[PDB]
Amino acid sequence: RSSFEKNPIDFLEAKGYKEVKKDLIIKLPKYSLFELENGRKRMLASAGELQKGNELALPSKYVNFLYLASHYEKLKGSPEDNEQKQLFVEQHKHYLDEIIEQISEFSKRVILADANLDKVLSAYNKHRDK
RNA sequence: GCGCAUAAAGAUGAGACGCGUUUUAGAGCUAUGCUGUUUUGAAAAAAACAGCAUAGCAAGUUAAAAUAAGGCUAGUCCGUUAUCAACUUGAAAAAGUGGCACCGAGUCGGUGCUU
DNA sequence: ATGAGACGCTGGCGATTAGCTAATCGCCAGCGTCTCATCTTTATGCGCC
RNA sequence: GCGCAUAAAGAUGAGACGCGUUUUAGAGCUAUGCUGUUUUGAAAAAAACAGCAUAGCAAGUUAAAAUAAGGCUAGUCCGUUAUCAACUUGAAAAAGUGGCACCGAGUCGGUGCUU
DNA sequence: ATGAGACGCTGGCGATTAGCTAATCGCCAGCGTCTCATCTTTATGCGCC
């Protein structure tokens, strides 16, 4: 860094370059944000690696459902509303497959999760009875 | 809202010790086979000269170098950590820089004024 | 007081000849101590404009 | 500007003949070695059963298929050549379609009107 | 008339693992005949509104 920031053009000429655009030398730190297609963003992880730059904007319903269904805080209160929420978990079992759809579209749109996603789907079908 | 007791914790900075790493020196060897071979020559053969391969062995502990590359500020000093968005000035420091009434809301889209 | 102007197998093969990133995954990451002091800060415990 | 003589040339269309190509049939062979092997078996070994390799040989002439793929129009017919710029209609045929006074001239650039 | 809120080595290697046009040049191209007729056209040679 010190040797490059001192004489940049001389360093590039020493590296093995000819006819170097002096005004086209961009300093790119880590996590430099870039965007390509369908809102798919990628962050510059290095000079030879990138990072995922998109979040799946999921509605509040699925979030609260996951909280109550996964049993995150033992949901203590008055037993009545706890049992109704338990019933609400047993009823909205389609939220599972809806989440699977959400992950599939978001992963096929940004992640490019292909074979890995197939392994995930196979595991979900194998464990759909759980 | 301090002066305070008990029991903890953190942080800072020095001073030093165990290795370790990688190199070199650990003068490791034996036999067999191979070719090139000064080779005895006109060739053959090595003393395999040169290496190669096959097996079989044998010891094995430690010593030295440096230890961010390096730097100059030549000190027995410094150099791995805080401290970096884009942007225009400004040497740097530092400054400035992107509107808003309203409707929707998929990585946002418009909209009045209107950049 | 006559003597120039008029120019091919190539394309479609093989078969040389030559040469290059990329996608997948695994591995594996210098670390050991002590001394010395130094300051903080926290848990609890006590006071009215 | 024809009727004409000499010497040439071209073009057209039929009718047929020589091959050729590539396949198959030219029943080619011998010995040796190899493995799998029903194998005599519990294995061995082939009769190498199966192929393989090494060498050595031997003949060798011709016969048949089709000959643009094919097509239908089933004829004993057709199919390699003229005949194709872009473009809009129009089935096709066929039609229409892109300016120009002026200055320069690198595969052209402008320009008045102005497409 | 108490019992939740605070969630990892990854990047940088090797080393698999996988896979693909392109640039250069050479070769080598179905061909043999005849018959039959058929028309043209050319060189030269001959004539005035």
mmCIF file of all heavy atoms in Angstrom, chain E residues 32-44:
data_model
loop_
_atom_site.group_PDB
_atom_site.id
_atom_site.type_symbol
_atom_site.label_atom_id
_atom_site.label_comp_id
_atom_site.label_asym_id
_atom_site.label_seq_id
_atom_site.Cartn_x
_atom_site.Cartn_y
_atom_site.Cartn_z
ATOM 1 P P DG E 32 -12.925 -35.996 -67.863
ATOM 2 O OP1 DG E 32 -11.618 -35.643 -68.456
ATOM 3 O OP2 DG E 32 -14.046 -35.039 -67.956
ATOM 4 O "O5'" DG E 32 -13.349 -37.388 -68.500
ATOM 5 C "C5'" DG E 32 -12.594 -38.515 -68.173
ATOM 6 C "C4'" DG E 32 -12.684 -39.562 -69.240
ATOM 7 O "O4'" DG E 32 -13.257 -40.776 -68.683
ATOM 8 C "C3'" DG E 32 -13.619 -39.244 -70.385
ATOM 9 O "O3'" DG E 32 -13.040 -38.361 -71.321
ATOM 10 C "C2'" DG E 32 -13.785 -40.628 -70.953
ATOM 11 C "C1'" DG E 32 -14.032 -41.411 -69.693
ATOM 12 N N9 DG E 32 -15.441 -41.468 -69.323
ATOM 13 C C8 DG E 32 -16.102 -40.738 -68.370
ATOM 14 N N7 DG E 32 -17.372 -41.031 -68.292
ATOM 15 C C5 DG E 32 -17.553 -42.014 -69.258
ATOM 16 C C6 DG E 32 -18.716 -42.722 -69.643
ATOM 17 O O6 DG E 32 -19.861 -42.623 -69.192
ATOM 18 N N1 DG E 32 -18.450 -43.633 -70.654
ATOM 19 C C2 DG E 32 -17.222 -43.827 -71.222
ATOM 20 N N2 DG E 32 -17.153 -44.745 -72.184
ATOM 21 N N3 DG E 32 -16.134 -43.173 -70.875
ATOM 22 C C4 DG E 32 -16.375 -42.284 -69.896
ATOM 23 P P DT E 33 -14.016 -37.435 -72.201
ATOM 24 O OP1 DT E 33 -13.199 -36.390 -72.850
ATOM 25 O OP2 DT E 33 -15.162 -37.077 -71.340
ATOM 26 O "O5'" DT E 33 -14.565 -38.438 -73.316
ATOM 27 C "C5'" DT E 33 -13.640 -39.046 -74.191
ATOM 28 C "C4'" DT E 33 -14.222 -40.276 -74.856
ATOM 29 O "O4'" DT E 33 -14.800 -41.167 -73.867
ATOM 30 C "C3'" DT E 33 -15.360 -40.037 -75.805
ATOM 31 O "O3'" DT E 33 -14.865 -39.571 -77.037
ATOM 32 C "C2'" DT E 33 -15.925 -41.440 -75.889
ATOM 33 C "C1'" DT E 33 -15.927 -41.830 -74.411
ATOM 34 N N1 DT E 33 -17.173 -41.414 -73.644
ATOM 35 C C2 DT E 33 -18.403 -41.980 -73.949
ATOM 36 O O2 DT E 33 -18.567 -42.844 -74.787
ATOM 37 N N3 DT E 33 -19.441 -41.526 -73.191
ATOM 38 C C4 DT E 33 -19.396 -40.570 -72.205
ATOM 39 O O4 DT E 33 -20.393 -40.223 -71.590
ATOM 40 C C5 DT E 33 -18.094 -40.004 -71.949
ATOM 41 C C7 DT E 33 -17.923 -38.947 -70.902
ATOM 42 C C6 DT E 33 -17.063 -40.445 -72.671
ATOM 43 P P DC E 34 -15.644 -38.413 -77.821
ATOM 44 O OP1 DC E 34 -14.649 -37.590 -78.545
ATOM 45 O OP2 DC E 34 -16.577 -37.791 -76.853
ATOM 46 O "O5'" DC E 34 -16.518 -39.239 -78.866
ATOM 47 C "C5'" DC E 34 -15.963 -40.415 -79.433
ATOM 48 C "C4'" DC E 34 -17.044 -41.404 -79.783
ATOM 49 O "O4'" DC E 34 -17.608 -41.965 -78.567
ATOM 50 C "C3'" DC E 34 -18.229 -40.797 -80.478
ATOM 51 O "O3'" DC E 34 -17.958 -40.630 -81.867
ATOM 52 C "C2'" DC E 34 -19.262 -41.866 -80.215
ATOM 53 C "C1'" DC E 34 -18.995 -42.185 -78.745
ATOM 54 N N1 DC E 34 -19.763 -41.319 -77.751
ATOM 55 C C2 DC E 34 -21.159 -41.440 -77.625
ATOM 56 O O2 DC E 34 -21.767 -42.255 -78.324
ATOM 57 N N3 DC E 34 -21.806 -40.647 -76.739
ATOM 58 C C4 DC E 34 -21.126 -39.789 -75.987
ATOM 59 N N4 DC E 34 -21.809 -39.040 -75.118
ATOM 60 C C5 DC E 34 -19.716 -39.655 -76.092
ATOM 61 C C6 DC E 34 -19.085 -40.429 -76.975
ATOM 62 P P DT E 35 -18.657 -39.434 -82.681
ATOM 63 O OP1 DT E 35 -17.921 -39.278 -83.951
ATOM 64 O OP2 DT E 35 -18.821 -38.278 -81.781
ATOM 65 O "O5'" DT E 35 -20.091 -40.014 -83.027
ATOM 66 C "C5'" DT E 35 -20.201 -41.239 -83.703
ATOM 67 C "C4'" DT E 35 -21.588 -41.778 -83.517
ATOM 68 O "O4'" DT E 35 -21.840 -41.997 -82.108
ATOM 69 C "C3'" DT E 35 -22.685 -40.830 -83.898
ATOM 70 O "O3'" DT E 35 -22.856 -40.745 -85.287
ATOM 71 C "C2'" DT E 35 -23.845 -41.491 -83.196
ATOM 72 C "C1'" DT E 35 -23.216 -41.765 -81.841
ATOM 73 N N1 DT E 35 -23.318 -40.635 -80.849
ATOM 74 C C2 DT E 35 -24.536 -40.275 -80.312
ATOM 75 O O2 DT E 35 -25.589 -40.812 -80.583
ATOM 76 N N3 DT E 35 -24.471 -39.266 -79.407
ATOM 77 C C4 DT E 35 -23.350 -38.588 -78.997
ATOM 78 O O4 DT E 35 -23.389 -37.680 -78.193
ATOM 79 C C5 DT E 35 -22.131 -38.995 -79.604
ATOM 80 C C7 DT E 35 -20.855 -38.318 -79.235
ATOM 81 C C6 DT E 35 -22.171 -39.980 -80.484
ATOM 82 P P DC E 36 -22.689 -39.327 -86.013
ATOM 83 O OP1 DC E 36 -21.723 -39.490 -87.118
ATOM 84 O OP2 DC E 36 -22.433 -38.322 -84.959
ATOM 85 O "O5'" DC E 36 -24.135 -39.065 -86.630
ATOM 86 C "C5'" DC E 36 -25.071 -40.116 -86.664
ATOM 87 C "C4'" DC E 36 -26.339 -39.709 -85.947
ATOM 88 O "O4'" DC E 36 -26.200 -39.911 -84.518
ATOM 89 C "C3'" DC E 36 -26.664 -38.255 -86.007
ATOM 90 O "O3'" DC E 36 -27.126 -37.854 -87.267
ATOM 91 C "C2'" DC E 36 -27.734 -38.210 -84.938
ATOM 92 C "C1'" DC E 36 -27.039 -38.982 -83.838
ATOM 93 N N1 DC E 36 -26.209 -38.111 -82.884
ATOM 94 C C2 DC E 36 -26.851 -37.278 -81.955
ATOM 95 O O2 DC E 36 -28.082 -37.256 -81.912
ATOM 96 N N3 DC E 36 -26.101 -36.530 -81.116
ATOM 97 C C4 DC E 36 -24.778 -36.579 -81.184
ATOM 98 N N4 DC E 36 -24.083 -35.819 -80.336
ATOM 99 C C5 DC E 36 -24.104 -37.414 -82.117
ATOM 100 C C6 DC E 36 -24.852 -38.148 -82.938
ATOM 101 P P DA E 37 -26.207 -36.878 -88.146
ATOM 102 O OP1 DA E 37 -25.963 -37.552 -89.436
ATOM 103 O OP2 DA E 37 -25.077 -36.454 -87.294
ATOM 104 O "O5'" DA E 37 -27.108 -35.585 -88.384
ATOM 105 C "C5'" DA E 37 -28.426 -35.698 -88.834
ATOM 106 C "C4'" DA E 37 -29.381 -35.240 -87.749
ATOM 107 O "O4'" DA E 37 -28.983 -35.802 -86.477
ATOM 108 C "C3'" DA E 37 -29.398 -33.748 -87.496
ATOM 109 O "O3'" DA E 37 -30.277 -33.106 -88.392
ATOM 110 C "C2'" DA E 37 -29.940 -33.696 -86.075
ATOM 111 C "C1'" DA E 37 -29.224 -34.870 -85.430
ATOM 112 N N9 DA E 37 -27.974 -34.512 -84.732
ATOM 113 C C8 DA E 37 -26.703 -34.925 -85.020
ATOM 114 N N7 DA E 37 -25.786 -34.437 -84.214
ATOM 115 C C5 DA E 37 -26.501 -33.636 -83.341
ATOM 116 C C6 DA E 37 -26.116 -32.827 -82.242
ATOM 117 N N6 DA E 37 -24.852 -32.690 -81.831
ATOM 118 N N1 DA E 37 -27.088 -32.151 -81.584
ATOM 119 C C2 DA E 37 -28.352 -32.290 -81.995
ATOM 120 N N3 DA E 37 -28.832 -33.016 -83.005
ATOM 121 C C4 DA E 37 -27.849 -33.671 -83.644
ATOM 122 P P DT E 38 -29.803 -31.802 -89.200
ATOM 123 O OP1 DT E 38 -30.485 -31.813 -90.512
ATOM 124 O OP2 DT E 38 -28.327 -31.764 -89.132
ATOM 125 O "O5'" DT E 38 -30.372 -30.589 -88.324
ATOM 126 C "C5'" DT E 38 -31.584 -30.761 -87.619
ATOM 127 C "C4'" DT E 38 -31.577 -29.991 -86.313
ATOM 128 O "O4'" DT E 38 -30.734 -30.671 -85.352
ATOM 129 C "C3'" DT E 38 -30.968 -28.605 -86.387
ATOM 130 O "O3'" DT E 38 -31.915 -27.700 -86.840
ATOM 131 C "C2'" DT E 38 -30.596 -28.340 -84.955
ATOM 132 C "C1'" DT E 38 -30.131 -29.711 -84.497
ATOM 133 N N1 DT E 38 -28.642 -29.881 -84.467
ATOM 134 C C2 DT E 38 -27.926 -29.247 -83.480
ATOM 135 O O2 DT E 38 -28.429 -28.517 -82.650
ATOM 136 N N3 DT E 38 -26.588 -29.457 -83.510
ATOM 137 C C4 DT E 38 -25.891 -30.250 -84.387
ATOM 138 O O4 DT E 38 -24.676 -30.374 -84.316
ATOM 139 C C5 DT E 38 -26.693 -30.914 -85.392
ATOM 140 C C7 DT E 38 -26.043 -31.798 -86.409
ATOM 141 C C6 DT E 38 -28.020 -30.703 -85.381
ATOM 142 P P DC E 39 -31.818 -27.203 -88.350
ATOM 143 O OP1 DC E 39 -32.772 -28.052 -89.067
ATOM 144 O OP2 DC E 39 -30.389 -27.230 -88.736
ATOM 145 O "O5'" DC E 39 -32.251 -25.669 -88.303
ATOM 146 C "C5'" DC E 39 -31.269 -24.658 -88.262
ATOM 147 C "C4'" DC E 39 -31.018 -24.208 -86.836
ATOM 148 O "O4'" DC E 39 -30.448 -25.288 -86.055
ATOM 149 C "C3'" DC E 39 -30.026 -23.081 -86.696
ATOM 150 O "O3'" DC E 39 -30.689 -21.871 -86.873
ATOM 151 C "C2'" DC E 39 -29.598 -23.243 -85.254
ATOM 152 C "C1'" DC E 39 -29.529 -24.762 -85.107
ATOM 153 N N1 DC E 39 -28.159 -25.400 -85.358
ATOM 154 C C2 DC E 39 -27.016 -25.050 -84.597
ATOM 155 O O2 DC E 39 -27.096 -24.210 -83.699
ATOM 156 N N3 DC E 39 -25.846 -25.674 -84.861
ATOM 157 C C4 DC E 39 -25.774 -26.593 -85.812
ATOM 158 N N4 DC E 39 -24.594 -27.174 -86.035
ATOM 159 C C5 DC E 39 -26.907 -26.967 -86.579
ATOM 160 C C6 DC E 39 -28.061 -26.352 -86.324
ATOM 161 P P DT E 40 -30.586 -21.077 -88.261
ATOM 162 O OP1 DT E 40 -31.951 -20.882 -88.793
ATOM 163 O OP2 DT E 40 -29.580 -21.785 -89.083
ATOM 164 O "O5'" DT E 40 -29.974 -19.666 -87.832
ATOM 165 C "C5'" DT E 40 -28.582 -19.523 -87.673
ATOM 166 C "C4'" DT E 40 -28.229 -19.189 -86.237
ATOM 167 O "O4'" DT E 40 -28.060 -20.427 -85.484
ATOM 168 C "C3'" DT E 40 -26.915 -18.448 -86.089
ATOM 169 O "O3'" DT E 40 -27.137 -17.062 -86.025
ATOM 170 C "C2'" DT E 40 -26.371 -18.976 -84.781
ATOM 171 C "C1'" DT E 40 -26.801 -20.437 -84.836
ATOM 172 N N1 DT E 40 -25.881 -21.400 -85.598
ATOM 173 C C2 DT E 40 -24.520 -21.515 -85.307
ATOM 174 O O2 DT E 40 -23.931 -20.882 -84.453
ATOM 175 N N3 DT E 40 -23.865 -22.442 -86.058
ATOM 176 C C4 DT E 40 -24.388 -23.245 -87.040
ATOM 177 O O4 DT E 40 -23.707 -24.042 -87.664
ATOM 178 C C5 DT E 40 -25.792 -23.085 -87.284
ATOM 179 C C7 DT E 40 -26.471 -23.895 -88.339
ATOM 180 C C6 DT E 40 -26.458 -22.206 -86.550
ATOM 181 P P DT E 41 -26.711 -16.124 -87.254
ATOM 182 O OP1 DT E 41 -27.954 -15.500 -87.750
ATOM 183 O OP2 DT E 41 -25.857 -16.906 -88.172
ATOM 184 O "O5'" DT E 41 -25.812 -14.998 -86.565
ATOM 185 C "C5'" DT E 41 -25.466 -15.131 -85.202
ATOM 186 C "C4'" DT E 41 -24.000 -15.478 -85.030
ATOM 187 O "O4'" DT E 41 -23.811 -16.912 -84.985
ATOM 188 C "C3'" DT E 41 -23.093 -15.085 -86.163
ATOM 189 O "O3'" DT E 41 -22.858 -13.690 -86.189
ATOM 190 C "C2'" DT E 41 -21.850 -15.852 -85.764
ATOM 191 C "C1'" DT E 41 -22.444 -17.179 -85.288
ATOM 192 N N1 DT E 41 -22.350 -18.269 -86.305
ATOM 193 C C2 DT E 41 -21.130 -18.858 -86.562
ATOM 194 O O2 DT E 41 -20.105 -18.572 -85.974
ATOM 195 N N3 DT E 41 -21.160 -19.839 -87.505
ATOM 196 C C4 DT E 41 -22.248 -20.269 -88.220
ATOM 197 O O4 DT E 41 -22.177 -21.153 -89.056
ATOM 198 C C5 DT E 41 -23.482 -19.603 -87.924
ATOM 199 C C7 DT E 41 -24.724 -19.985 -88.660
ATOM 200 C C6 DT E 41 -23.474 -18.644 -86.994
ATOM 201 P P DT E 42 -22.366 -13.025 -87.565
ATOM 202 O OP1 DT E 42 -22.638 -11.575 -87.476
ATOM 203 O OP2 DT E 42 -22.930 -13.830 -88.669
ATOM 204 O "O5'" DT E 42 -20.782 -13.248 -87.570
ATOM 205 C "C5'" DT E 42 -19.984 -12.716 -86.535
ATOM 206 C "C4'" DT E 42 -18.647 -13.429 -86.455
ATOM 207 O "O4'" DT E 42 -18.850 -14.862 -86.331
ATOM 208 C "C3'" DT E 42 -17.780 -13.300 -87.685
ATOM 209 O "O3'" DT E 42 -17.068 -12.091 -87.701
ATOM 210 C "C2'" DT E 42 -16.836 -14.474 -87.481
ATOM 211 C "C1'" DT E 42 -17.793 -15.554 -86.985
ATOM 212 N N1 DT E 42 -18.353 -16.428 -88.086
ATOM 213 C C2 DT E 42 -17.538 -17.352 -88.706
ATOM 214 O O2 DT E 42 -16.368 -17.529 -88.415
ATOM 215 N N3 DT E 42 -18.144 -18.074 -89.703
ATOM 216 C C4 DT E 42 -19.454 -17.980 -90.120
ATOM 217 O O4 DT E 42 -19.909 -18.678 -91.016
ATOM 218 C C5 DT E 42 -20.249 -16.993 -89.435
ATOM 219 C C7 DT E 42 -21.685 -16.792 -89.808
ATOM 220 C C6 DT E 42 -19.665 -16.273 -88.471
ATOM 221 P P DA E 43 -16.891 -11.299 -89.086
ATOM 222 O OP1 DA E 43 -16.602 -9.880 -88.782
ATOM 223 O OP2 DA E 43 -18.036 -11.659 -89.951
ATOM 224 O "O5'" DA E 43 -15.586 -11.972 -89.712
ATOM 225 C "C5'" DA E 43 -14.379 -11.950 -88.994
ATOM 226 C "C4'" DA E 43 -13.220 -12.405 -89.853
ATOM 227 O "O4'" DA E 43 -13.034 -13.845 -89.698
ATOM 228 C "C3'" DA E 43 -13.402 -12.203 -91.349
ATOM 229 O "O3'" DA E 43 -12.876 -10.959 -91.733
ATOM 230 C "C2'" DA E 43 -12.620 -13.351 -91.934
ATOM 231 C "C1'" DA E 43 -12.974 -14.468 -90.974
ATOM 232 N N9 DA E 43 -14.261 -15.098 -91.268
ATOM 233 C C8 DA E 43 -15.376 -15.058 -90.498
ATOM 234 N N7 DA E 43 -16.390 -15.705 -90.991
ATOM 235 C C5 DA E 43 -15.903 -16.271 -92.138
ATOM 236 C C6 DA E 43 -16.501 -17.085 -93.103
ATOM 237 N N6 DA E 43 -17.767 -17.493 -93.027
ATOM 238 N N1 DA E 43 -15.753 -17.464 -94.152
ATOM 239 C C2 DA E 43 -14.487 -17.049 -94.224
ATOM 240 N N3 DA E 43 -13.808 -16.268 -93.375
ATOM 241 C C4 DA E 43 -14.587 -15.907 -92.342
ATOM 242 P P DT E 44 -13.795 -9.883 -92.484
ATOM 243 O OP1 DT E 44 -13.235 -8.542 -92.217
ATOM 244 O OP2 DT E 44 -15.201 -10.174 -92.129
ATOM 245 O "O5'" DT E 44 -13.580 -10.254 -94.029
ATOM 246 C "C5'" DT E 44 -12.245 -10.259 -94.544
ATOM 247 C "C4'" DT E 44 -12.040 -11.287 -95.651
ATOM 248 O "O4'" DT E 44 -12.340 -12.625 -95.168
ATOM 249 C "C3'" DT E 44 -12.955 -11.143 -96.845
ATOM 250 O "O3'" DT E 44 -12.517 -10.091 -97.673
ATOM 251 C "C2'" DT E 44 -12.774 -12.503 -97.485
ATOM 252 C "C1'" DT E 44 -12.886 -13.391 -96.245
ATOM 253 N N1 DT E 44 -14.306 -13.807 -95.884
ATOM 254 C C2 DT E 44 -15.002 -14.690 -96.697
ATOM 255 O O2 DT E 44 -14.550 -15.170 -97.721
ATOM 256 N N3 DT E 44 -16.261 -14.995 -96.257
ATOM 257 C C4 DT E 44 -16.890 -14.523 -95.122
ATOM 258 O O4 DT E 44 -18.026 -14.862 -94.814
ATOM 259 C C5 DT E 44 -16.113 -13.618 -94.315
ATOM 260 C C7 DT E 44 -16.694 -13.034 -93.063
ATOM 261 C C6 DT E 44 -14.878 -13.311 -94.727
#
